[PDB]
Design a protein around this ligand. Structure first.
Ligand SMILES: CCc1cc(=O)[nH]c(=O)[nH]1
Length: 147
């Protein structure tokens, strides 16, 4: 209702090519991004210093929908077993906590736009695109109220 109208938290889009990697993340509550993506999330997490959550909005590239919401729950460990994701393109791992597993079609979010990404729809983001807090509130309310 007015729950989401907090003033702390940072929100990022997660774009996965792999449906297998979504399933593994939900099963084991972990994730891994590119090197550049991990560094961005690790900085946001460490600078948050616990004063609020880091939310992750997951969407599989090409699927036409978002598939869930997770919260970051650790910094990035860069020295972990390799080859655990569906493509061996990844060094490291961080903990997440899946908060919401539901398919939300892009049609329900296309009209929200990111002033920090040339006003492109939030549904046209790349991996680890950060969402401004005020637009993030609108997306979460839509996700949590979809049926
Ligand atoms: C390591 C899991 C993963 C898969 C993918 O396709 N993209 C990404 O950023 N992380």
């Amino acid at each position: 209702n007015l729950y989401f109208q907090m003033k702390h938290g940072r929100v990022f889009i997660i774009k996965s090519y792999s449906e297998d990697d979504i399933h593994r993340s939900i099963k084991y509550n972990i994730w891994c991004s590119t090197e550049h993506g991990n560094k961005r999330l690790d900085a946001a997490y460490r600078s948050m210093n616990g004063k609020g959550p880091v939310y992750l909005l997951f969407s599989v590239n090409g699927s036409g929908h978002f598939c869930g919401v997770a919260e970051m729950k650790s910094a990035v460990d860069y020295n972990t077993c390799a080859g655990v994701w569906s493509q061996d393109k990844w060094k490291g791992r961080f903990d997440v906590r899946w908060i919401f597993v539901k398919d939300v079609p892009n049609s329900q979010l296309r009209h929200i736009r990111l002033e920090n990404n040339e006003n492109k729809p939030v549904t046209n983001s790349r991996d680890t695109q950060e969402v401004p807090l005020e637009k993030a509130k609108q997306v979460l309310k839509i996700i949590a109220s979809y049926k």
